[PDB]
């Protein structure tokens, strides 16, 4: 919920997940996500509905999107002898979906 300084009013902008309600969301540099971005990704992939509770707006936007993501193995190269867990910093609940 951000306010444009020139026009000075609140706008409810959903994430890329919300914008791609009935489409795809291409997430490049998937390993290099912020904590908030990771939490939002997890919420969208699990419940298909991002919820917002800021500035008095208490609602759950809908985001039913197929995610096509590109991520880089740890160290800029995939180590074959390790499993998928050690190769990518994403935790198992993120990958399982």
């Amino acid at each position: 919920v951000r306010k444009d300084p020139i026009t000075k009013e609140w706008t409810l902008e959903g994430g890329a997940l919300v914008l791609a309600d009935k489409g795809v969301c291409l997430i490049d540099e998937f390993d290099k996500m912020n904590d908030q971005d990771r939490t939002s990704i997890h919420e969208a992939m699990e419940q298909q509905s991002i919820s917002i509770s800021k500035a008095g707006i208490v609602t759950t936007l809908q985001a039913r999107c197929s995610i096509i993501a590109a991520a880089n193995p740890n160290g800029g190269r995939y180590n074959s002898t390790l499993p998928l867990a050690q190769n990518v910093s994403l935790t198992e609940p993120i990958l399982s979906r």
Partner: protein
């Protein structure tokens, strides 16, 4: 003369297009709206509504569009502590009375909780007990005793724990 005048109240609402149904890199278009009398205090921010009103024009060559409110078709929204019926019609009450006397209603509610989910029978029974909740009590000295039952699920992934939680929120009054 203020002590003799009579007043009515006005409340300004601002409507925005549904955030998903917007051009990709464009700020959603919002439109200033006005209501009065008994239509005030009928919505809260974040609610998804349908509006019947008069499209109008306000001068700040260009003009500012806005809508007078004639009726607010408030859709079904999040059920909060305040947002609840709390009032049961008679026929509903007798139907619940009939249901309470069924001998297998414990099994029915066990079967009714996550029927698509296979197994986890005692888990479903505990979920039913959680949904009912215990008794909330207040001792004379001010001591308050817990009147809620909190349940933990702990197991390997893929055991439908997330799906069971989703069902619990879908069935419970507030969650």
């Amino acid at each position: 003369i203020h002590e003799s005048s009579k007043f009515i109240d006005q409340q300004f609402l601002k409507l925005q297009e549904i955030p998903e149904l917007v051009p990709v890199g464009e700020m959603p278009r919002n439109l200033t709206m006005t209501c009065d009398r008994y239509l005030t205090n009928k919505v809260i921010p974040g609610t998804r509504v349908t509006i019947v009103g008069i499209y109008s024009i306000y001068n700040s060559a260009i003009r500012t569009p806005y809508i007078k409110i004639l009726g607010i078709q408030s859709d079904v929204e999040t059920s909060s502590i305040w947002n609840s019926v709390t009032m049961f019609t008679e026929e509903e009450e007798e139907e619940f009375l009939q249901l309470s006397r069924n001998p297998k209603l414990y099994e029915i509610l066990t079967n009714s909780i996550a029927p698509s989910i296979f197994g986890n029978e005692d888990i479903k029974k505990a979920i039913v007990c959680l949904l009912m909740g215990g008794s909330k009590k207040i001792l004379p000295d001010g001591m308050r005793l817990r009147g809620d039952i909190n349940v933990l699920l702990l197991g390997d992934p893929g055991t439908a724990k997330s799906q069971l939680l989703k069902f619990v929120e879908k069935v419970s009054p507030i969650a």
